[PDB]
UniProtKB/Swiss-Prot annotation, chain A:
There is a cross-link at residues 103, 118, 162 (Glycyl lysine isopeptide (Lys-Gly) (interchain with G-Cter in ubiquitin)). Present with 66000 molecules/cell in log phase SD medium. The keyword Nucleus applies. It comes from the Eukaryota. The gene is RPS6A. GO terms for biological process: maturation of SSU-rRNA from tricistronic rRNA transcript (SSU-rRNA, 5.8S rRNA, LSU-rRNA); translation. GO terms for molecular function: structural constituent of ribosome. It is found in: Cytoplasm; Nucleus, Nucleolus. This is Small ribosomal subunit protein eS6A.
From Swiss-Prot, chain B:
It is found in: Cytoplasm. The gene is RPS11A. Belongs to the universal ribosomal protein uS17 family. InterPro entries: NA-bd_OB-fold (IPR012340), Ribosomal_uS17 (IPR000266), Ribosomal_uS17_arc/euk (IPR028333), Ribosomal_uS17_CS (IPR019979), Ribosomal_uS17_N (IPR032440). GO terms for biological process: maturation of SSU-rRNA from tricistronic rRNA transcript (SSU-rRNA, 5.8S rRNA, LSU-rRNA); ribosomal small subunit assembly; translation. The keyword RNA-binding applies. Keywords: Acetylation, Cytoplasm, Isopeptide bond, Ribonucleoprotein, Ribosomal protein, RNA-binding, rRNA-binding, Ubl conjugation. There is a cross-link at residues 8, 26, 36-37, 59, 76, 85, 113, 121 (Glycyl lysine isopeptide (Lys-Gly) (interchain with G-Cter in ubiquitin)). This is Small ribosomal subunit protein uS17A. There are 2 genes for uS17 in yeast. Component of the ribosome, a large ribonucleoprotein complex responsible for the synthesis of proteins in the cell. The small ribosomal subunit (SSU) binds messenger RNAs (mRNAs) and translates the encoded message by selecting cognate aminoacyl-transfer RNA (tRNA) molecules. The large subunit (LSU) contains the ribosomal catalytic site termed the peptidyl transferase center (PTC), which catalyzes the formation of peptide bonds, thereby polymerizing the amino acids delivered by tRNAs into a polypeptide chain. Gene3D superfamilies: 2.40.50.1000.
Curated annotation (Swiss-Prot), chain C:
GO terms for cellular component: 90S preribosome; cytoplasm; cytosol; cytosolic small ribosomal subunit. This is Small ribosomal subunit protein eS4A. Coiled coil: none annotated. The modification Phosphothreonine is found at residue 103. HAMAP family: Ribosomal_eS4. Component of the small ribosomal subunit (SSU). Mature yeast ribosomes consist of a small (40S) and a large (60S) subunit. The 40S small subunit contains 1 molecule of ribosomal RNA (18S rRNA) and 33 different proteins (encoded by 57 genes). The large 60S subunit contains 3 rRNA molecules (25S, 5.8S and 5S rRNA) and 46 different proteins (encoded by 81 genes). Disulfide bonds: none annotated. Keywords: Cytoplasm, Isopeptide bond, Phosphoprotein, Ribonucleoprotein, Ribosomal protein, RNA-binding, rRNA-binding, Ubl conjugation. Residues 30-93 form the S4 RNA-binding domain. Present with 573 molecules/cell in log phase SD medium. Component of the ribosome, a large ribonucleoprotein complex responsible for the synthesis of proteins in the cell. The small ribosomal subunit (SSU) binds messenger RNAs (mRNAs) and translates the encoded message by selecting cognate aminoacyl-transfer RNA (tRNA) molecules. The large subunit (LSU) contains the ribosomal catalytic site termed the peptidyl transferase center (PTC), which catalyzes the formation of peptide bonds, thereby polymerizing the amino acids delivered by tRNAs into a polypeptide chain.
Swiss-Prot record, chain E:
It is found in: Nucleus, Nucleolus. Induction: Up-regulated during cold stress and following nutrient replenishment by dilution of cells fron exhausted to fresh minimal medium. Belongs to the AATF family. This is Protein BFR2. The chain holds residues 460 to 496 of 534 of the full protein. Involved in endoplasmic reticulum to Golgi transport. Involved in a protein-transport step blocked by brefeldin A, which disrupts the Golgi apparatus and its incoming protein flux. May also be involved for mass growth or cell proliferation. Present with 15400 molecules/cell in log phase SD medium.
Amino acid sequence: MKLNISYPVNGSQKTFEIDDEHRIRVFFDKRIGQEVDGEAVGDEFKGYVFKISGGNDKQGFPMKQGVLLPTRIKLLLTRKRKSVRGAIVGPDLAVLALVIVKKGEQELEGLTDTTVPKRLGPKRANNIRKRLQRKRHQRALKVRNAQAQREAAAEYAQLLAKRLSER
Amino acid sequence: QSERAFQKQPHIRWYKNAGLGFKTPKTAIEGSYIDKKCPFTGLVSIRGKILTGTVVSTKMHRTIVIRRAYLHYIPKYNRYEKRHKNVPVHVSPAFRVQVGDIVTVGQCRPISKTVRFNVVKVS
Amino acid sequence: AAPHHWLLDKLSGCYAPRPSAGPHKLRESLPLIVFLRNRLKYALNGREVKAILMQRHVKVDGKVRTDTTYPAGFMDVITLDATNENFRLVYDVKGRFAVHRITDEEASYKLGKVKKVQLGKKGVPYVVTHDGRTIRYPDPNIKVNDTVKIDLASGKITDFIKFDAGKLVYVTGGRNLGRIGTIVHKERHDGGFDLVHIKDSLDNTFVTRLNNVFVIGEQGKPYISLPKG
Amino acid sequence: GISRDSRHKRSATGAKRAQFRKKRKFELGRQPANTKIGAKRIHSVRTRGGNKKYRALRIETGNFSWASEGISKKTRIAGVVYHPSNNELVRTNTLTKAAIVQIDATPFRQWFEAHYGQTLKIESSVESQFSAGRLYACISSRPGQSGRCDGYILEGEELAFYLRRL
Amino acid sequence: KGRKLNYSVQDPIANYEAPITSGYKWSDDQIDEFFAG
Amino acid sequence: VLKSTSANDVSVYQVSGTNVLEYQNRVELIQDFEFSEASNKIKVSRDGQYCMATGTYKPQIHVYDFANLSLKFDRHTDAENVDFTILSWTKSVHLQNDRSIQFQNKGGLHYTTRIPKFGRSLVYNKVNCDLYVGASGNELYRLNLEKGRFLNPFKLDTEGVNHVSINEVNGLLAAGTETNVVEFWDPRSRSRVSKLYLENNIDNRPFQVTTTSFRNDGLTFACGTSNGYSYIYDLRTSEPSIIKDQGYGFDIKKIIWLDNVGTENKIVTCDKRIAKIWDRLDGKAYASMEPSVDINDIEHVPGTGMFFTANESIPMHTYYIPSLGPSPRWCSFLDSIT
RNA sequence: GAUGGUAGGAUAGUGGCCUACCAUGGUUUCAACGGGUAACGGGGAAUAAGGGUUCGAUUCCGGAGAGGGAGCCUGAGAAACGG
RNA sequence: AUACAGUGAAACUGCGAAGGCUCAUUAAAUCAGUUAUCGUUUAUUUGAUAGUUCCAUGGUAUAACUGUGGUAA
């Protein structure tokens, strides 16, 4: 199997082609979200814990989180009949995705000891932290719209009053 | 004058006038008859055209079957074959129309599958 | 593919210009392309009548309204800025759109038949016409088929012509479409063939409908000027 | 529903050989949503542009109107005992227009005691329900079209007008 | 009583299902000695 | 691990409840299990898959494939339904709230016929193939699927019948009327055999029997009421019974056995809000299945310990009991998650 | 549902358009209802031509169909040539 | 022109395609005009048309993008 592993806070991710499936058999019949130990997948990474986060099997088909039935099934997604592998991992995964949420006993020259930075700082004002002439013009046009319309309406209602007095 | 459920009443005793040269009798202004689809109190409003003729049958209630013979200038066999027409019409509280009885009707708001006319006059 | 009213020569094309939506109906109007291009011939084709519409010479009913298929119906005063062109277009005696030339004090107004008077919402009397000028507050004695006179600078009714026996009426509709003379007879029926009847040179008689006729003035004094021959 | 057209049926002359047409969009008969009592759920269906139509199925908060003063106040629903536009409709206890349904009249008690002082001029066979709690009231509004349950109370003449029936 | 109880024969349901020979696993004598009383 | 409600020293679980980190540890079993704000009636077919759930507004048919964990289709039927059965696989017969009857096929809507009066219940006969339909009045009708005729309708008492069922191993036609009489007809003779009367000790008002059931021994009969009172019956001293008042007691609608799985002599009762389960020969509650909304009816999947309700909310609840039995082969990791 | 009445449902609303109840109606010799084609032809459906007298300009034959019936969705407008 | 500044592959966007073949034979029910809809829907065209306020600016969650990959696709 191949194991994709991601250390999210440092920003690191790498795949590891692990053969010798009795190392793999710790993950078997454990669906998405349930944690795992490093102790029964490896010896050189002990004290390790990985939250699984899906994985494409051979024939490339993804698993969506938490349905049932670790074979493939035909569901309705974003609505048409798409084929989707079950959330439970068994013997026939090509890659399996993992998030390491605690470093254990050995440094990794791919994951721990090497890291990438972020993209770019914020752009919004409140995101950087954590117009008034338009406020003049809006209020002035609003009070002028009132002093035009609400006076002109009564100014022809008084002409109706003149027609009613003359009639 | 109440043989059915569900508050047989006018729908807002009540009285109105369609105008346009057709009288409303005094029991149809102030009387105990409901006038659900008789256009003088009614719920319907008047429009369209007004047709006149005698009757054939008034067997069922709220069905006035008018006859209407009219002249048409036939050019084909150069003689007038005589016309005949039929139209069902709802009642009014002004005349129990029997056989004969040339009456007229005004077009309004299809009531059953085939009636758009309701009696407004008897003479 | 054309109507009869446009005075459209047959050797013109294949597709006829449908007018767009607007004040008047499709069946009682001519657009600006059939007005300017092939009737009084200020253009030669659709490209240059769109060019002068983008230049905005037209001032129909005192507003510009730059559009090719704008449905100018009855007596919308087409105003053109260059050479002070003021055109009131009415019906002739054989169904077409006779476009009379008028002057500025006559194109400062128009008239319109009232269609209905309503107590619509909030106690406001109400009046509509064939271009749909919903203008506020006429007198209570506006019946149907009377004639308001629009201001054409603001929208207000300035003068009013009452529909009664002995008024000068214009007939636009049916087999009497475009006749003037308004007096042999009056006959209001109760739903059809109801009208005031119109004379001829030998004072002949004619039948039409109420909605297919509308008043333009008095017996000898219409304040509209009319073309002659 | 199915249809709204005379083409599937016979006229006043007795014609035949129909075989007419594939039915259009504008013969649209939707399903009859028999509105019941439940928790308030209104389906917001579309028609004719943005003409949203409120199709109520499980409405409760009926605004029923005190007749002699015209006081439309809020109450619950119990059940319809008589409605012979379908005599099985009262067997199944739905809620349609012009039905006579029962109401616990406790806010009408509150309004009477609030704008008259004392508790109990009004008719005796509705004073019995003033005492007990359940009064008869007939639905005016259309939950299948406007989605609401409004109605008017039974007061005297209309009361006996229905009580002699059932 | 027009559409009410048309005692006619209808086309698609005339062979919609098919019967069974033995049917009840009991006997009819077991019916008689089941609810004699 | 899904949470469990408190009970009498026993555990139950719900999947697709009104409440059912949770988004990323979702425990959804059947995708698109939600209707248009209510539910009419759900039942599971005789074979190991293909459950059918009737609709609420623009009512549908909603066949779910159990070996695909999702929806197959939704045939929007013409009227709102009350009762139906399934006739194996693809055929099924329905009757709506109006007096009309639909025959769904693989293509769907094979016929629409009618009955002269408004109907309330339908059952099918496996032997000689006549569906019996109970309606309002003197009238309990037949539609035989052999030759499509009509049969000589069974003459009832005054008001009618709320439920009809035939016995399976021997065919004893039940008909739960309004005047407490159960009106057993014989599917052989087309005549009555008995008119058993139902009694109590409280006698609030003249209750009407609404639920009838049998099982596959052919000797007992489960009876209901319009009051929340289960009843058992045998031929052995058929005048008394054993009774079960329920703590809320409006109208019991679904009483079904456990006659094909282990932990025997147990029966499920179900009224409008609660569904409980108790044991025979004592009348003591094994468990109960209290949801957060009312119940339109229920059903129990055969061979295993799971239940499917039709309720008045947007989804339907499924109830798993890990002491009545296991979870089935298509749900065979429910025992691994909880 | 034939003909109408009362009420509800659905409607964009009128409407037996659909359902409960009720009445036994309605069209017709003053042509009901039914019979077919030079109904690949006809009805102005329209232009007419300065001599062709039923050739001589056109809209429409009827409704459907996007492999086959069924169900659903979108939109000012649809039971969509494009789901 | 050290927070933007022109060319611009590929992505969101506004719109485009805005009306095309064959098959079974309907007698004013297919069609044409006309009456009406205070019996009704309506984008666009046009004319009109808004008065409730107790002790200097509001929140994370997704793209495009990077990076690790699966699958014959």
